[PDB]
């Protein structure tokens, strides 16, 4: 085989300083993952994925460092119709992945310089479609103030004005209110499917980033 | 017409065919089966794939079998679905109803996920996001594998009615070495594991006591994995306990459900950041049916059964079913216990009972008054005598059950424990070596349960502090620092540069994280206090020591309790010059004794 | 020997294929004791027998067709061999 | 006019944490400046330039934030044949500038989110063709060990093995040895033109980054 | 054929035409001219552009004129080219030979660039990297502007033979407000500025003294800009001083060139980080011609003329022309001065002369031995008496020339000055208010000129330290910390936690920035020292004080110098218990007195 | 009025243009008291007089053509007007 699963992962010191904060993207939209890696000595570059819902391990798509050919595509079983890309600026290379974000394809994506054995994580992106918030039984419904990226650790949505929320029952007395970006259908008609599990594989990372506005979320220690 | 032809070339002149209707392949389950396997792979690739998965007899503990008699109104349904074995190598991915519940440890690189189905369950252990180890137990389907492998190299342990099948990459044995040991799960399988009552006593709590004593929680080790597997097996047994709907004596069902919920809560606190939202565990009797069948005749005449029932209802995420009078009676029982074991170590029965009450008030939002009245009592039993008796308790090896090791000092509102307070408690200058180190971790384990109080949910969980819900209207927080908004009386420094700060707030107001200096009112004093109509009832006292950590908070409910506490003959108050005694009245008054 | 399949979406599902063929070792020179070929409207594909037979058996079990599978599975018996011993 | 020169600049906190270290690129090669800005609220994005040799002030190329049209191109008088680029990418836009690097076009390039008055510098790139090093009269010629980007503050070249040096007289007793990337002509034939001024507009930034290997360079305070 | 037709449409029937040959436009001059102007813009755009540039009589100081008699073997050439006014708005960009010299202040957002041409020069002041202000002086071409603007709104000052042209964006007047003052440059233009001898005395040094006293160096303010303009004007005047090649008395040319080089060096140290590499300033006589004409007859009998000539050669970047014997004679003169003004404040003549020598040794790499012998002397004149006299000097207003304010304490190898050492020098407990504040900044201005020594270029310029080149073979560095590799004798702590560290190294070895502890040899002692053949000659002594900063290093060359120093009557040695005296000999010995 | 120019490289240099024309106010209705037009192969452009005439004056000065420019510059006199007073 061209390689195996990364055995000696490493993280660049800019890994957690340059990774954009989680992003809320409307369901059914054609998101794409950008990237930019300076000219290197690594034979292979790749994009590593970890889907939030019902997934374990990692799946990676391996591109030749210079030419841009495909050497191995592990994202098959979850992204049958994803199209990659590779453009060469003599100064540095660019590669991208494109798909149709939905409930099953939200997760973390990481550019990874690669060779046969090792790897060096460089950047991370988190894609979300539904976010959990808890409301007390009688308190008025919260009202977050999502805005476009801005800068910092605030969760953001490229289309904040299409924000809509729904409630999915109770949890330890609280009422679970979920936030999502709609308008996929006309007006308020659209209502996503109720999430089938929480906390999920992405719970740890997401809850480390603040949500602008007043709202309560269970948080790590 | 439009059928698919299967032929085997009888001869060049003519071939024999099977005319399989295409309707049999109409369902999408055919395609999603096909896309998971590359049919172009040669035998060499299949041999290579098997070369990386460690085999039972060649790399793991050798195969061996056990045999024993496996035996002790709407039925529940798995209202949740998950994709089993997604993107796996040796197994087909399928979409089925399931009970999926994931635990995420402190370390972002580790997590354990438990999945259960109708006839078998799965345990997923993940390290550093690589391919995880899988433990599968139950009735296995005939065609689970994606290629015609020899599955007899994968069943690690076989029982009278089920078998254990293990998949793990050969590179992972440098970590999951416990597989190589022949004792793995010998204590959890080699008996009638369908006997839930004996199962919990013999297998789960056995691991729980050891893990708690050794302080291995939050770390993925052999004992924790064995615990998780035992928990999953216990859940599997519950579904097997006569779902047909045989008549059940309610107290027995209450005990069974209470044990299961205790197990789940312990694992949540031992291996998870926050509880899983899934809840709605399948039980012999639906919680609504229990409620109605037990409150139509008022069949409950025992307080213990009532507290167990309320625990079941609260943990099952059905708060709206809890009436106020039952909680009032629970609070009355709590006050009874407070009067009984005042300023002394809790008897085993008291510990076991009060464990449920302490774990209850933190899992509700209705009836804040009674919950406060119970929380204050749970905090007020943490007398230094209780700490000493707990210290002597830990050294005892005869601890069958996990409940016996409960202490109100752990999960209550006091979260400022340190080795200094523990060590200085002993005049012998000696403590059983393991205990003074283990109790620190035991009492510092994080339940993080203060969100269920409107005026305190914003209080940071890291810094040491103390909380006291003396009554409905008032709520005191004692801190080394001005943490939250409200009236804040400063007190003499424990050490120059560190101040014992007392914050008084009203429960009817939202929690606020104000760190500024304001309303820094001074401490008042009174000597010949007035007890007319017991204006001092429902008050908490604190003996602040000038040159060391604060110690030994106590809560007095009635006039008799405060009379007992004041009486120096009981050693509650000593009046030494170094230490000073303070009173926190039911209203906002803070004064010196 | 076998038609390279660069992508899975390229590989026809049951909605496009029309005939699946087999040839035993009696006429096939392959070391696998046989060969299999399929028919699609645009291009045929060569595929290894044993993998296809295992997939067919898995599908049959999934739909619980064992009752009606006697003759068919018996006919596939020659190709269900090569069960992978660890070596 | 669509806008004026930036009246009130700002710098992102990642400005000096994400700007790649200076790069040495042979003359006559077609470099392109990558960039990646997350979805924002700024009407205009632009690329700002400061050429090293005989230049003052700044010149800006302003693109509409969303569509990608051109609104104003100040780089004309120095980059008559430079071609820009814009690729809408719903998660976040991308734009680039291409040219033929030479002696007159080396300098600093900075992506700048823009509106009519303000601006927000986001990233910086430094392009160099000749670097100065000083050698003592009798000491043997130095030998730097340029390599591909790797990571850090080390000057780097996408083609280190084409490194060549020449001397351009004396300075305060020292001998000035210059380093450049050659092979534009066969073997050692090509010799760049002698630099006409030092320290130039780019001297301050460049000399703050180390050069791997043993060598002496006049350094800021 | 192939010509271009210019026509004006005499009539529809026929038009009159000019048949201009295309050869007149064959050259690239036309093309680079056309691309700089948009021929499609309307009058509105041109009006808008002018609205942004402040005008002389409307925004700046009103126009006014001055009039005076402007008057006092290969010729040089501008061996350097630059693109004047690149990407400008009102002016055409052109490529011409020029003298281009850029200064970059401490702050990265500021820099001043000086450009000169045959008949006019340009001063560019840049802030924040926006469009820079421009001052243009000299004979201006007829068609400089890019559009037919009214240039009379831009000339700020006019002279008998030249005009001053100022361009600045209207938004920039919030910073360059000095333009609004009518006094701007009144002292640098309103006289016969071609009289260089009077020019430097009246205009440049006048600004230099004030800037140095007020400590405005490294900051872009009115005085610094006036200084830069005066320097550019002085350079312009020099090129105008009879380049035809009239006979010149060599001493006068030496004085003129030395003054110009002093000006350039002062500006380099005051307004830049590193010297501009351009050098090769055009002079009345080429440096090679001066060298050969002067060393053919050995006409330089005056030592001062010799040092001036060596300074000229060294600064002009022609080191290879300097012979060894001349430097030996310079070192002998330095020793003469050392003997003369030993342990006393330097007379004005001594300061002026030794300034050149101190600035010389730092700008060469040949003859390291003699450079060391001069550097040690330059360091050894920094006696506390010199500090006091310089302190009193700094308050005098009668300082015509910048040389008089030189002190060896500044540029020499002692770079550990602090207000504590200065303040404690006074028993009155009083120093003229501004003087102690100004002395620190004057003595802490950074030449960073230790790079010209093979064994010390490694040494960081930040940390306080001391350097001493006692001889050719040995070289001591005294520091609070182990900075460089070599033998390092520790000494008693100045304060507990801080130590006086003495490092001894051999000059013939390249240095390395080794911070490790090694060869931490102990201090030896000797009382009845042996002076046979003056084994103590060429040695430096230091009176270390235990409870304060180290002070008052001294260097003894011959036996007589050490005899004088030891004699306590001269107050060189006091022998107080707190202070201790050490000897650093020509070899590696470090010992106590 | 004036042929819009999007990029300088598009604007012909002297290598491509073949004739430059002028029309005074006596026949032109423009407020600029005239107009000028140039011709390049299959491309004509409209340009304002005064800016152009200033450019030719600058070119003449740079090339030192004042001696030979008498008649030409005299002919450009009607268009060299509109000197930009600050208002
Ligand atoms: C995939 O790339 C990694 C890049 O690190 C390769 O590992 C690297 O192997 C080189 C071999 O020379 C190691 O360089 C040497 O390592 C030690 C420690 O410094 C020492 O001998 C030298 O100073 C030198 O640096 C390098 O350290 C090592 N990197 C790591 C992180 O261990 C790896 O071999 C590549 N894979 C293949 C199949 O080539
Ligand atoms: C170009 O974009 C900048 C983005 O900052 C615009 O300046 C911003 O203008 C808004 C106007 O509401 C300012 O918001 C307010 O500012 C103050 C300070 O916080 C206060 O009134 C409010 O809390 C609110 O935040 C914002 O501060 C200001 N940004 C900065 C850095 O000063 C600018 O106006 C835009 N240009 C045009 C022509 O619209
Ligand atoms: C099982 O899950 C279903 C999912 O639909 C739940 O039904 C939904 O319940 C929510 C509130 O929890 C309502 O807002 C929806 O309208 C319900 N949907 C339908 C189709 O009825 C159902 O309550 C769950 N049952 C249990 C016992 O948990
Ligand atoms: C809290 O309750 C106590 C009960 O004793 C109140 O005590 C009174 O305090 C005032 C001064 O504040 C005295 O004049 C009264 O004599 C006290 N009453 C008695 C019965 O002793 C106290 O005031 C209350 N505080 C608040 C804030 O309501
Ligand atoms: C003026 O600049 C020219 C630029 O070519 C210099 O000529 C070069 O000098 C270097 C050494 O400095 C030689 O290596 C080159 O071979 C020279 N080139 C040519 C074409 O001769 C010249 O030395 C400079 N003159 C002065 C006085 O500085
Ligand atoms: C440096 O020179 C002095 C000159 O006095 C040397 O002094 C000698 O020191 C040794 C002990 O180190 C004594 O035994 C000798 O008697 C001294 N000699 C004389 C003539 O007094 C000193 O050793 C020299 N140091 C080095 C390192 O060479
Ligand atoms: C994805 O979404 C796009 C529109 O955003 C749509 O055209 C396309 O059909 C969808 N499906 C796939 C497989 O890309
Ligand atoms: C890369 O993306 C561009 C649009 O950004 C698209 O035109 C092109 O086809 C893509 N390349 C591949 C190989 O899919
Ligand atoms: C730039 O260089 C490329 C080759 O790198 C060449 O084809 C092209 O003609 C050059 N010129 C311009 C204007 O880009
Ligand atoms: C952008 O670059 C691509 C190659 O990366 C090129 O094909 C395309 O034409 C460029 N776009 C423009 C507008 O020049």
UniProtKB/Swiss-Prot annotation, chains A, D:
The keyword S-adenosyl-L-methionine does not apply. One of its GO terms (cellular component) is membrane. Glycans are attached at residues 85, 100, 115. It is found in: Host endoplasmic reticulum membrane. Changing residue 103 to M: In strain: Isolate 2J, Isolate 10J, Isolate 29C, Isolate 27C, Isolate 18M, Isolate 33J, Isolate 45J and Isolate 14. It comes from the Viruses. It is a single-pass type I membrane protein. Residues 5-221 are extracellular. GO terms for biological process: symbiont-mediated perturbation of host natural killer cell mediated immune response. Keywords: Glycoprotein, Host endoplasmic reticulum, Host membrane, Host-virus interaction, Membrane, Modulation of host NK-cell activity by virus, Signal, Transmembrane, Transmembrane helix, Viral immunoevasion. Changing residue 170 to T: In strain: Isolate 2J, Isolate 10J, Isolate 25J, Isolate 39J, Isolate 45J, Isolate 29C, Isolate 27C, Isolate 18M, Isolate 33 and Isolate 14. Induction: Early-late protein. Increases in abundance throughout the viral replication cycle. Disulfide bonds: none annotated. Evasion of NK cell killing. Blocks surface expression of PVR which is a ligand for NK cell-activating receptors. Binds human PVR in the endoplasmic reticulum and prevents its maturation and transport to the cell surface. Targets also the natural killer cell activating ligand NECTIN2 for proteasome-mediated degradation. Additionally promotes intracellular retention of TNFRSF10A/TRAIL-R1 and TNFRSF10B/TRAIL-R2 and thus down-regulates their cell surface expression. Interacts with human PVR. Interacts with human TNFRSF10A and TNFRSF10B. Forms a homodimer that engages two TNFRSF10B monomers. This is Protein UL141. It comes from Human cytomegalovirus (strain Merlin). The gene is UL141. The chain holds residues 33 to 253 of 338 of the full protein.
């Amino acid at each position: 085989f061209a390689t195996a699963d990364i055995a000696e992962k490493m993280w660049a010191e800019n890994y957690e300083t340059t990774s954009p904060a989680p992003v809320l993207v409307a369901e059914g939209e054609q998101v794409t993952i950008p990237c930019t890696v300076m000219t290197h000595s690594w034979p292979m570059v790749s994009i590593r994925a970890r889907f939030c819902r019902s997934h374990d391990g990692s799946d990676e798509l391996i591109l030749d460092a210079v030419k841009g050919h495909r050497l191995m595509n592990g994202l098959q079983y979850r992204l049958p119709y994803a199209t990659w890309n590779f453009s060469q600026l003599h100064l540095g290379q660019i590669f991208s992945l494109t798909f149709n974000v939905s409930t099953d394809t939200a997760g973390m994506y990481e550019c990874v310089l690669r060779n046969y054995s090792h790897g060096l994580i460089m950047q991370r992106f988190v894609i979300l479609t539904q976010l959990e918030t808890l409301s007390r039984p009688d308190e008025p419904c919260c009202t977050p103030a999502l805005g476009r990226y801005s800068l910092g650790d605030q969760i953001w949505s490229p289309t904040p004005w299409r924000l809509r929320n729904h409630d999915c029952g109770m949890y330890r007395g609280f009422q679970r209110n979920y936030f999502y970006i709609g308008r996929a259908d006309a007006e308020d008609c659209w209502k996503p499917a109720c999430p089938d599990e929480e906390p999920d594989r992405c719970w740890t990372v997401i809850q480390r980033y603040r949500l602008p506005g007043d709202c309560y979320r269970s948080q790590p220690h | 017409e439009n059928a698919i032809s299967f032929n085997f070339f009888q001869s060049y002149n003519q071939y024999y065919v099977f005319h399989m209707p295409r309707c049999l392949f109409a369902g999408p389950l055919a395609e999603q089966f096909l896309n998971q396997v590359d049919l172009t792979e040669t035998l060499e690739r299949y041999q290579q794939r098997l070369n990386t998965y460690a085999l039972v007899s060649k790399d793991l503990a050798s195969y061996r079998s056990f045999s024993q008699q496996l035996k002790a109104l709407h039925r529940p349904h798995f209202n949740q679905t998950c994709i089993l074995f997604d993107g796996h190598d040796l197994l087909f991915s399928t979409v089925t109803p399931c009970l999926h519940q994931g635990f995420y440890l402190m370390d972002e690189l580790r997590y354990v996920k438990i999945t259960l189905t109708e006839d078998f369950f799965v345990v997923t252990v993940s390290i550093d996001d690589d391919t995880p180890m899988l433990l599968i137990f139950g009735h296995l389907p005939r065609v689970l594998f994606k290629a015609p492998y020899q599955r007899d190299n994968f069943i690690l342990r076989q029982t009278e009615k089920h078998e254990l099948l293990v998949l793990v990459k050969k590179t992972q044995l440098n970590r999951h070495s416990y597989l190589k040991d022949s004792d793995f799960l010998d204590a959890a399988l080699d008996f009638n594991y369908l006997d839930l009552s004996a199962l919990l006593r013999n297998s789960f709590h056995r691991y729980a006591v050891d893990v708690l004593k050794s302080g291995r929680c939050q770390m993925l080790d052999r004992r924790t994995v064995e615990m998780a597997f035992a928990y999953a097996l216990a859940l599997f047994a519950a579904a097997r306990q006569e779902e047909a709907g045989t008549e059940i004596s309610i107290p027995r069902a209450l005990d069974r459900q209470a044990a299961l919920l205790q197990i789940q809560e312990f694992m949540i606190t031992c291996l998870s950041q926050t509880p899983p939202r899934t809840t709605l565990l399948l039980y012999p009797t639906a919680v609504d049916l229990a409620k109605r069948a037990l409150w139509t005749p008022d069949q409950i005449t025992d307080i213990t059964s009532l507290v167990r029932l309320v625990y079941i209802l609260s943990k099952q995420n059905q708060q709206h079913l809890i009436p106020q009078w039952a909680l009032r009676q629970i609070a009355d029982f709590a006050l009874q216990l407070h009067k009984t074991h005042l300023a002394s170590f809790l008897s085993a029965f008291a510990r076991q009972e009060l464990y449920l009450m302490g774990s209850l008030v933190h899992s509700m939002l209705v009836h804040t008054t009674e919950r406060r009245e119970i929380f204050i009592v749970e905090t007020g039993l943490c007398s230094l005598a209780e700490l000493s008796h707990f210290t002597q308790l830990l050294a005892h090896p005869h601890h069958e059950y996990l409940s016996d090791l409960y202490t109100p000092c752990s999960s209550s509102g006091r979260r400022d424990h340190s080795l200094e307070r523990l060590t200085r408690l002993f005049p012998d200058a000696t403590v059983p070596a393991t205990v003074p180190a283990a109790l620190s971790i035991l009492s510092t384990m994080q339940p993080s349960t203060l969100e269920t109080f409107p005026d305190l949910f914003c209080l940071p969980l890291g810094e040491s502090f103390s909380a006291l819900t003396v009554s409905e209207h008032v709520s005191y927080v004692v801190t080394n620092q001005y943490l939250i908004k409200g009236i804040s009386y400063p007190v003499s420094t424990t050490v120059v540069g560190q101040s014992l700060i007392i914050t008084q707030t009203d429960s009817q107001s939202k929690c606020e994280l104000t760190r500024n200096m304001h309303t820094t009112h001074s401490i008042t004093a009174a000597l010949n206090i007035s007890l007319e109509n017991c204006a001092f009832c429902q008050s908490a006292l604190l003996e602040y020591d000038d040159t060391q950590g604060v110690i030994n908070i106590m809560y007095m409910h009635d006039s008799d309790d405060v009379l007992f506490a004041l009486d120096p003959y009981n050693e509650v108050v000593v009046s030494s010059p170094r230490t000073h005694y303070l009173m926190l009245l039911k209203n906002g008054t803070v004064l010196e004794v | 020997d076998y038609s390279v399949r660069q992508s899975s979406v390229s590989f026809p599902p049951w909605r496009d294929i029309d005939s699946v063929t087999f040839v035993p070792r009696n006429l096939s020179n392959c070391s696998a004791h046989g060969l299999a070929v399929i028919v699609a409207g645009n291009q045929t594909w060569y595929v290894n027998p044993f993998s296809l037979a295992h997939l067919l058996d898995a599908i049959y079990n999934v739909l619980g067709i064992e009752d009606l599978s006697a003759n068919f599975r018996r006919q596939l018996a020659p190709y269900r061999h090569t069960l992978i011993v660890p070596q």
